[PDB]
Design a protein around this ligand. Structure first.
Ligand SMILES: CCNC(=O)c1cc2c(-c3cccc(Cl)c3)ccnc2[nH]1
Length: 154
């Protein structure tokens, strides 16, 4: 039993756009743009919607780069996160109710203020490798189990 989510990373040649999450789950960490896929939209549609809702930005194209499954101990629903990349943004990022956007240099990624699983998979994305990951968390700080591999098809 799993719930569909999207995550979009805006990755340009020498920088990445992250947003400080201002409220809800994982508030106080720098995240990519995403959320729950709704009834009546495709996964990709949901990714675009979340990006626009959270940052103002629209894009030409999204590229599938990964899938991560998250289990949180004591929560019934697994999270099935479809991860996308883009380097064809249209607009300037702006702050929303949910996210405060900021550009980071690729050697200045704020890992200490990110989800701890990010240290494992985010480098694969920077290296342009497609991946499947699974992370079992106890609360929001502790990884109990994980798997991570590269794949040919996301
Ligand atoms: C490189 C930036 N990484 C992330 O943006 C990132 C997000 C998450 C989430 C998460 C929680 C709620 C909704 C969604 Cl879509 C994801 C859970 C664990 N690790 C994460 N990492």
């Amino acid at each position: 039993a799993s719930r569909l989510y999207t995550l979009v990373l805006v990755l340009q040649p020498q920088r990445v756009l992250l947003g400080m999450k201002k409220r809800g789950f994982g508030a106080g960490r720098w995240n990519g743009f995403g959320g729950k896929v709704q009834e009546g939209e495709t996964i990709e549609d949901g990714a675009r919607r979340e990006l626009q809702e959270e940052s103002g930005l629209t894009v030409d194209a999204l590229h599938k780069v990964g899938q991560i499954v998250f289990e949180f101990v004591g929560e019934p629903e697994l999270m099935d996160v479809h991860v996308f990349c883009t380097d064809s943004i249209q607009g300037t990022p702006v702050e929303s109710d949910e996210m405060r956007p900021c550009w980071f240099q690729l050697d200045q990624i704020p890992f200490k203020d990110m989800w701890p699983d990010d240290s494992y998979w985010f480098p694969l994305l920077l290296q342009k490798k497609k991946f499947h990951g699974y992370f079992k968390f106890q609360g929001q700080d502790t990884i109990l189990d994980y798997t991570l591999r590269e794949v040919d098809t996301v």
